[PDB]
Amino acid sequence: TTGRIVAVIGAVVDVQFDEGLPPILNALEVQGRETRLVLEVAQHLGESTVRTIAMDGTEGLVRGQKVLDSGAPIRIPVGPETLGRIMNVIGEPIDERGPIKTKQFAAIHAEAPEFVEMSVEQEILVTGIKVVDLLAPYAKGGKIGLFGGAGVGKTVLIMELINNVAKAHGGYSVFAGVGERTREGNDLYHEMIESGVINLKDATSKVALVYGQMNEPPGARARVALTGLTVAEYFRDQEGQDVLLFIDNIFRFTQAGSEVSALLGRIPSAVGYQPTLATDMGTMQERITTTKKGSITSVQAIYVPADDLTDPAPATTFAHLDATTVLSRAIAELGIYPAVDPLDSTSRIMDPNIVGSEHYDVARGVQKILQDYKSLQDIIAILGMDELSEEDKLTVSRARKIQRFLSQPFQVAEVFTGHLGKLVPLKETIKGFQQILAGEYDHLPEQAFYMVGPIEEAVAKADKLAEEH
Amino acid sequence: AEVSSILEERILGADTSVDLEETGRVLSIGDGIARVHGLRNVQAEEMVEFSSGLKGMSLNLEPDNVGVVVFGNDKLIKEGDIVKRTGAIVDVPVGEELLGRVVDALGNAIDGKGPIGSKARRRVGLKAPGIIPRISVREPMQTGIKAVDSLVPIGRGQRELIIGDRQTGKTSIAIDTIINQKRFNDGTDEKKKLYCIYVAIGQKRSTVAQLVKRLTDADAMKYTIVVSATASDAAPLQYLAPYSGCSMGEYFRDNGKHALIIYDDLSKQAVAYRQMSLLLRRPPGREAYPGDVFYLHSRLLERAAKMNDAFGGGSLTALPVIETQAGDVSAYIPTNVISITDGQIFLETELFYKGIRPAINVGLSVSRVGSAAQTRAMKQVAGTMKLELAQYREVAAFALDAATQQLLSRGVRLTELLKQGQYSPMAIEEQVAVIYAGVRGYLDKLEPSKITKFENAFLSHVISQHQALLSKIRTDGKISEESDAKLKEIVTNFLAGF
Amino acid sequence: VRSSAGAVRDAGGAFGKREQAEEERYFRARAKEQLAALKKHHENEIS
Amino acid sequence: STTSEQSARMTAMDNASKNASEMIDKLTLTFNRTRQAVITKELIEIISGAAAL
Numbered sequence A: 001t002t003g004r005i006v007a008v009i010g011a012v013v014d015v016q017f018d019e020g021l022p023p024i025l026n027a028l029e030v031q032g033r034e035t036r037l038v039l040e041v042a043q044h045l046g047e048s049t050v051r052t053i054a055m056d057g058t059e060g061l062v063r064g065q066k067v068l069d070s071g072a073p074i075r076i077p078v079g080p081e082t083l084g085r086i087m088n089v090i091g092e093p094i095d096e097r098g099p100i101k102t103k104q105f106a107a108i109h110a111e112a113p114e115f116v117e118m119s120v121e122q123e124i125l126v127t128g129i130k131v132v133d134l135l136a137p138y139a140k141g142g143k144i145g146l147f148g149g150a151g152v153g154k155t156v157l158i159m160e161l162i163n164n165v166a167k168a169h170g171g172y173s174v175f176a177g178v179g180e181r182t183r184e185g186n187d188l189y190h191e192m193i194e195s196g197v198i199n200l201k202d203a204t205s206k207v208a209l210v211y212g213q214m215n216e217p218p219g220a221r222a223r224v225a226l227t228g229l230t231v232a233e234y235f236r237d238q239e240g241q242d243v244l245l246f247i248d249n250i251f252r253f254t255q256a257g258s259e260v261s262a263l264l265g266r267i268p269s270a271v272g273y274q275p276t277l278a279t280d281m282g283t284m285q286e287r288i289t290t291t292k293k294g295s296i297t298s299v300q301a302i303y304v305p306a307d308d309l310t311d312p313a314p315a316t317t318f319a320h321l322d323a324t325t326v327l328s329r330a331i332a333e334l335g336i337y338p339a340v341d342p343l344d345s346t347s348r349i350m351d352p353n354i355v356g357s358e359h360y361d362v363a364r365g366v367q368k369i370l371q372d373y374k375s376l377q378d379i380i381a382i383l384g385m386d387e388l389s390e391e392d393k394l395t396v397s398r399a400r401k402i403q404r405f406l407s408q409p410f411q412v413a414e415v416f417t418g419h420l421g422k423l424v425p426l427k428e429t430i431k432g433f434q435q436i437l438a439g440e441y442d443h444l445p446e447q448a449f450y451m452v453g454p455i456e457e458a459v460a461k462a463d464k465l466a467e468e469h
Numbered sequence B: 001a002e003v004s005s006i007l008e009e010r011i012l013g014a015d016t017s018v019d020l021e022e023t024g025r026v027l028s029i030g031d032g033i034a035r036v037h038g039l040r041n042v043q044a045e046e047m048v049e050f051s052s053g054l055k056g057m058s059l060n061l062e063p064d065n066v067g068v069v070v071f072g073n074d075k076l077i078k079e080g081d082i083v084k085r086t087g088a089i090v091d092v093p094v095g096e097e098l099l100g101r102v103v104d105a106l107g108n109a110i111d112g113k114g115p116i117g118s119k120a121r122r123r124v125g126l127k128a129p130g131i132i133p134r135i136s137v138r139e140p141m142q143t144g145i146k147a148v149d150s151l152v153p154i155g156r157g158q159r160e161l162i163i164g165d166r167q168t169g170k171t172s173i174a175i176d177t178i179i180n181q182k183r184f185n186d187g188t189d190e191k192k193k194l195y196c197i198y199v200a201i202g203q204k205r206s207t208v209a210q211l212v213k214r215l216t217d218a219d220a221m222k223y224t225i226v227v228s229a230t231a232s233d234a235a236p237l238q239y240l241a242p243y244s245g246c247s248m249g250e251y252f253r254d255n256g257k258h259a260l261i262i263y264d265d266l267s268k269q270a271v272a273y274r275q276m277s278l279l280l281r282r283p284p285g286r287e288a289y290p291g292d293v294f295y296l297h298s299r300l301l302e303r304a305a306k307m308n309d310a311f312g313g314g315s316l317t318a319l320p321v322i323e324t325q326a327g328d329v330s331a332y333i334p335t336n337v338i339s340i341t342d343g344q345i346f347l348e349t350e351l352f353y354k355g356i357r358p359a360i361n362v363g364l365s366v367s368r369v370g371s372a373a374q375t376r377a378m379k380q381v382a383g384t385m386k387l388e389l390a391q392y393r394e395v396a397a398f399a400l401d402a403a404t405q406q407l408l409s410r411g412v413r414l415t416e417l418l419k420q421g422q423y424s425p426m427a428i429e430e431q432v433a434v435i436y437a438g439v440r441g442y443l444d445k446l447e448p449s450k451i452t453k454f455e456n457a458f459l460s461h462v463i464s465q466h467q468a469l470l471s472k473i474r475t476d477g478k479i480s481e482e483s484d485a486k487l488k489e490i491v492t493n494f495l496a497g498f
Numbered sequence C: 001v002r003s004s005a006g007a008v009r010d011a012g013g014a015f016g017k018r019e020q021a022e023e024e025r026y027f028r029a030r031a032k033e034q035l036a037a038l039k040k041h042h043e044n045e046i047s
Numbered sequence D: 001s002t003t004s005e006q007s008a009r010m011t012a013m014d015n016a017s018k019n020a021s022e023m024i025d026k027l028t029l030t031f032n033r034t035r036q037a038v039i040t041k042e043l044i045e046i047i048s049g050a051a052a053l
């Protein structure tokens, strides 16, 4: 079918069809563009007009430009040939390496798995990060969230996870960069090429990348998440194998949805958000799931505007996640990195019957001591440390040691700290915290525990501190 | 006599050609927005012209009329006027011909001084460079402020943000950065020369005149462009000035050269865009800003790239300036731009009045590049300085034992070391010398009220007696063992002799 | 509107910084004492 | 000295609690004003968006 642009307002294009209309969500191709501009149908306005969001700049469009109707939603190339490549929302490659030569094209819009496909099994995923493993342990096939404002460590933490889990992970992996700095996209491309997960020579690449960075118009940011999700879904089903899926950030999907809603004629909701915030986010987060045919481990970075965890976007995202690790700025100011908040992070598998009674009891003891420390900090602001009950000073000392011991040096944060990355096995973290609580270290100074791996490294650092005293 | 001769020279060459052009009738003009009827083939965000020679942009393409924004005054456009489409997306002149010229948002010379001899035009609304052209930020962008070059370093291709309240010293940092580049631009190698662009958005013409004369006094217009869209310029001009300046800098970065652009402020481009959008009748959003207010900036700051050596190797640094309200960094535009940019430089009034100038809040100021994009000498010294101030800031709220007393002493010495004046940026080696003297326990003997006296006298002494050592540090780009021993003996001698 | 534990240091006003410093000075002192004791034990346990 | 010191500490704490109570009253009034203003602002934004279609 052939139609005809009749209006262009910002990123929203109104296209008139003389023949039969195209169904909602179909992709239309504008005729007369040097590059490829794809509009996606979003509404039928009557009188044969259809409103659409453009997946590219709408500059140089002329009222009357002919438009072709592809007849299907945006179909991206999928398969093992996309690994090691980069893609747009519309699937064309942006790595300047030639066409993606696949036999399968998958539409980016699909129904979520039905209730009779859900897996109900959970087993810890050991990431090698002390705070994550202890207080908010992850789970294979579960959806992970990384909340936090700007400048707290979301990108560094997600890069660290790619460094650990993806490098030593047999299955494939997908990284969908949604509305993030292009500098970071290039940095990740080159870091992956260096590590070897992306191999430009052979066909041994283990990562497929999709990029919708923040220079793109809202239409492309609102759909690059679906493109990455489609690649991951194919690797889940047809390949019948484990998959990882990293997204950064999944707040730009919501925000990009909000930048066009007012132009599509919808009244806004609570805080300048589209009325369809929860439904639009659900119809996407419900395809990132571990069905009985495959298994997607989804890590999502979620911008929290102005550190406000009660904003509608993060507030709604909370309900779609198994594990959450709420990075906190108030802890990043103290220099504790990663700034994961131990009291504001949770996991579903954090039960004594899934992790064990020792792990669970250590975690709960740590959380309780930190909460007691918070209670005491109010009193110390008036009395002073010198006036506390000789038992309270013990609580404060243990709490500060535990606060420092959760900090850890990453292998990707060598540039900032200059230290060396450490991977701490789960048993070592449990032992370290159980000992710190039990009092077996109430003589070593606090700073001995700052930015070290297992507890023995803290002992060695304390020994060095004493020798050069 | 020759005055009239050169007058005639202009007429002698005219535009005889009259062409058959598409047109439209202004159905309604008011508040700076015209609703043309016709222009059936006008493109989106194309440039149209009015019967009086006044330009405009076709921003809205509705089925029945085209919503045009007028790049200038609006009293001269009547109903039933004629709008001729120029058939060209909005574009601005670019080239080295613009250096030293004050121009308006559309690239028209504003200081007299004749016209611009630009041979090339570039579209304001160009897409940012892809993921492949770029390359990680390598070189350092020398700002001249000790506290910025040491604690929050800026590379070339980075996008720092200078965010603060009104009258905390943001434009001062911008001008110091512009002025400092004089030493590099005067030299010979072209790999260090950095051409500066200053976009002045919403600033009253008096402020821009003061700024231009300040640059002229420091002889810094040889390489500076000033794109002024002042308060009295219609909103469609203040909305477009950042993009014009960014195109003028995109030319440099695309031709293997390095450029620095300073949008000042972006919080006023946001207001101009809001006015435009509200007068085109587009529905408002949060705080009345349109929905596309993040895009507005993200598409603009994403053009500050660092091209790899295959694409010339050129770079374009950006230093957007935001203005918060009573330190409410949590506002809408501040948070958008903070989540867009790489680093930040927080200026605080409580620090401005407490005597710390520049008010840079080193506790919160960040720079993702950090380690990279810092000279080896500065990397060596500023690291220990950063640790010392980090420890000092913890125990600072009060004012016993020798260890913590000396920790506070060192912190205070370093703090008074970081202060600075206006329009007197320092060479990097001089900054290294001062910071080395301060951080190696030398100033711990002096009083903290005399540290400025030291800093100044030490600089004056070294700049003459030990020019050779500074040249060594600059050329070799590190504090070698022999250089360290020298520095040691110079500082030890000078301290006692003062 | 209620109040919760650990709120004095959440506001970050004057009391927050005052409390942070009152804690840091004390624990720097105790760390110094413990490091001295650790050095003494190191020396006394070489043989 | 200890008797007088304990008496003085009791008096000082009582006065500090009284001052904190006055400050709490003032801040509660300010908080209520700000909460109402925020409700009104958000509602007016919604109304303007709805009527500006």
Ligand SMILES: Nc1ncnc2c1ncn2[C@@H]1O[C@H](COP(=O)(O)OP(=O)(O)OP(=O)(O)O)[C@@H](O)[C@H]1O
Residues within 6 Å of the ligand: B165, B166, B167, B168, B169, B170, B171, B172, B173, B323, B357, B358, B420, B421, B422
């Ligand atoms: N390093 C400094 N030393 C002394 N004074 C300074 C310094 N930096 C800024 N000032 C003073 O601060 C005042 C405001 O400077 P500046 O214009 O840079 O701030 P601003 O925030 O850009 O102002 P506005 O936002 O109102 O344009 C100036 O009058 C100047 O005297």
Ligand SMILES: Nc1ncnc2c1ncn2[C@@H]1O[C@H](COP(=O)(O)OP(=O)(O)O)[C@@H](O)[C@H]1O
Residues within 6 Å of the ligand: A149, A150, A151, A152, A153, A154, A155, A156, A157, A337, A338, A410, A413, A416, A417, B366, B367, B368, B369, B370
């Ligand atoms: N593990 C870490 N160690 C030290 N510093 C870190 C760490 N993670 C993040 N940072 C700090 O945060 C900055 C990067 O933050 P980033 O995570 O990229 O921002 P966001 O989380 O908002 O995307 C760096 O400049 C660095 O100083």
Ligand SMILES: [Mg+2]
Residues within 6 Å of the ligand: A154, A155, A180
């Ligand atoms: Mg990030």
Ligand SMILES: [Mg+2]
Residues within 6 Å of the ligand: B170, B171, B172
């Ligand atoms: Mg200013």
